[PDB]
Design a protein around this ligand. Structure first.
Ligand code: UTG
Ligand code: ZN
Ligand code: ZN
Length: 417
């Protein structure tokens, strides 16, 4: 039943640097024979501009489809992405890399770079920050295949020991006299265990991390639409006529009256049985065929969703103090929506919400209520997934990016069951 690999390796090289580097060099030479000339050229460009190429691969998919196509960095992105995808690994591989604790919204400082010790207080604070959370990792990154020792670069107090699952793209390559391994990331990680370790008198937190598989179509709306239609083409027929009629009414513009009623706390202030009945039916419809796999969706959120307005000075994310204030208020916090929440399987910008500065990137766990409404023909919504009213979201991490000269935010959140 097991595939025999061309160059044998264990799942983890552990502290064995010599054996890891030997394997990595042999793999780099082996995979080089599978690469196309345009793929080899993309790898050469990568070594001369890795920082900018990596930053581009993190946020390229948030633009309009025509902007992605027109971007001068897109050709290089596609070629380097294809190169890594030429070596999907046959069995899991544990990798190692140093990470900033800020990557997990930990701002209390594990220890300063010049400091040695890690207090029990900071270790416990870090544990409570990362426990029971998923964190999206995205973009090109170089990783190591063995545990660092004395002679190795250790730029932070946090060491990631991450299990890459089978079929993850991994590209070992040569760079002048050295060898490195490139991955594209693009998955959720969970930190299962943290331990204090000592390397040459200095203390580090070693984080045992694993990938929690999910669908994330990003700018590939065609692939997302195929998945949505494969799972929800027969959804309309699973509903009662009243449920289907209320879902249809909502989709055709009834969402304004229903959601305004929910936002205004209408069930408490002025109960409307006709609106309550529609809400009941739509909620039931969303529970008929739960989201069948962990799924990432994207919502271009209005400032009112985060207690701001279009003219609020706090909504100007071009100022670093406004980003820091937003992160302080929302990172690690829960956000509950009284209304139904429309999202898209695509991360691309859309003309209807062109100027919205907040991109809510939601991971929906398997079994959540929801439905791919765009499986119903002739609908305005773009590749739409509707989430149930009253949904709660845990905000895990917030990032920023530039959309032209306007700074926008990416809010990495998880739907709570
Ligand atoms: S940050 C880091 N590894 C990640 C990496 C590979 C290339 C560039 O950055 N340090 C390290 C060095 C040697 C062995 C193991 C580790 Cl974790
Ligand atoms: Zn010590
Ligand atoms: Zn309700």
């Amino acid at each position: 039943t097991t595939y025999k690999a061309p160059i044998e390796r264990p799942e983890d090289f552990l502290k064995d640097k010599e054996k890891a580097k030997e394997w990595e060099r042999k793999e780099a030479e082996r995979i080089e024979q599978k690469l196309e000339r345009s793929e080899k050229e993309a790898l050469e460009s990568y070594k001369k501009d890795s920082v900018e190429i990596s930053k581009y691969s993190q946020t390229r998919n948030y633009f309009y489809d025509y902007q992605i196509e027109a971007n001068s960095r897109e050709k290089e992105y596609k070629e380097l992405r294809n190169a890594i995808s030429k070596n999907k690994i046959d069995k899991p591989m544990y990798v190692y890399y140093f990470e900033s604790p800020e990557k997990f919204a930990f701002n209390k400082v594990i220890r300063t770079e010049n400091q040695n010790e890690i207090s029990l207080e900071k270790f416990n604070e870090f544990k409570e920050t990362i426990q029971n959370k998923l964190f999206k990792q995205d973009g090109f990154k170089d990783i190591s295949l063995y545990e660092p020792g004395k002679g190795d670069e250790k730029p932070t107090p946090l060491l990631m020991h991450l299990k890459l699952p089978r079929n993850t793209g991994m590209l070992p390559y040569t760079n002048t006299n050295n060898v490195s391994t490139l991955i594209e990331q693009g998955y959720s990680i969970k930190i299962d265990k943290i331990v204090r370790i000592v390397i040459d008198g200095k203390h580090y937190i070693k984080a045992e991390a694993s990938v929690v598989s999910s669908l994330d179509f990003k700018d590939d709306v065609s692939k997302g639409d195929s998945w949505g239609k494969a799972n929800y083409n027969d959804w309309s027929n699973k509903l009662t006529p009243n449920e289907l009629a209320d879902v249809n009414d909502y989709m055709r513009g009834g969402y304004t009256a229903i959601n305004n009623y929910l936002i205004s706390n209408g069930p408490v202030n002025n109960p409307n049985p006709e609106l309550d009945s529609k809400i009941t039916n739509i909620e039931n419809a969303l529970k008929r065929e739960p989201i069948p796999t962990n799924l990432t969706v994207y919502r271009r959120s209005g400032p009112q969703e985060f207690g701001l307005t279009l003219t609020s000075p706090e909504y100007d994310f071009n100022k670093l103090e406004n980003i820091d204030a937003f992160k302080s208020k929302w990172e690690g916090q829960a956000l509950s929506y009284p209304n139904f929440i429309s999202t898209s399987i695509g991360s691309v910008n859309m003309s209807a919400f062109a100027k919205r500065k907040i991109v809510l990137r939601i991971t929906i766990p398997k079994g959540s209520p929801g439905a791919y409404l765009s499986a119903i023909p002739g609908y305005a919504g773009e590749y739409e997934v509707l989430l149930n009213h009253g949904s709660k979201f845990k905000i895990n991490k917030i990032d920023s990016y530039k959309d032209g000269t306007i700074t926008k935010l990416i809010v990495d959140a998880t739907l709570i069951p």
